[PDB]
């Protein structure tokens with residue numbers, strides 16, 4: 001589950017979206033090797049449940065870091081903070097905060113020196129996190145996402161339509177394409193540096209068989225393909241590639 005800082009971000013941002021956050025703020029320092037912080041405005045965790053959820057994903061994260069989670073439940077005036085180091089609860093505290101949850105993961109794998117030493121360079125880890133937040137942004141257009149890395153605001157995306165969200169992410173104008181129990185919706189831009197993104201139902205799909213086929217029927221083309229299927233095609237993708245101008 002947790003091999004590097006991007007895995008941590010993934011789990012925290014999933015938790016935020018699970019909690020109906022409309023704003024998710026991510027901050028990384030030293031590529032996430034020093035700090036990973038994820039803050040959301042979702043419904044929070046009741047004080048009675050804060051100690052439980054550390055012990056699943058949070059337990060596995062808290063076991064390999066210096067870990068704080070603070071949360072204010074939508075029904076409570078104050079929040080509660082739990083502090084954990086390598087699985088060992090150091091204590092809890094009442095904290096003033098906004099409704100929502102904020103998790104801080106520091107010194108990832110400090111207890112596992114070889115694993116820390118073999119982590120990729122800061123800039124490599126940074127890009128993985130950037131790509132992951134883009135991925136989440138592309139399927140959550142109603143959600144605001146911000147990314148700070150080494151104190152710079154690297155990504156800021158406000159709530160918008162889906163087409164507006166695509167164009168903000170890829171910094172380009174797209175044409176929207178649609179086809180047909182299968183439904184396909186794609187945003188393409190033809191000049192670019194080819195990039196081929198595939199989402200099936202709501203999830204990002206990395207398959208090499210589909211990508212190279214998108215490169216085949218579409219152009220250096222940006223293709224962002226949202227596919228919906230029943231609990232399980234390529235000729236419909238070829239049909240889709242025939243609608244542009």
Ligand SMILES: Nc1ncnc2c1ncn2[C@@H]1O[C@H](COP(=O)(O)OP(=O)(O)CP(=O)(O)O)[C@@H](O)[C@H]1O
Nearest residue numbers: 015016019040042043044045053056057058059101
């Ligand atoms: N940002 C957040 N907002 C609200 N609740 C949160 C939260 N982060 C964690 N939680 C609560 O903590 C619980 C445990 O989170 P954790 O990620 O460890 O397990 P999970 O229930 O999400 C299953 P998994 O992550 O393995 O799919 C969640 O079920 C949720 O109740």
Ligand SMILES: [Mg+2]
Nearest residue numbers: 011014015057
């Ligand atoms: Mg989770």
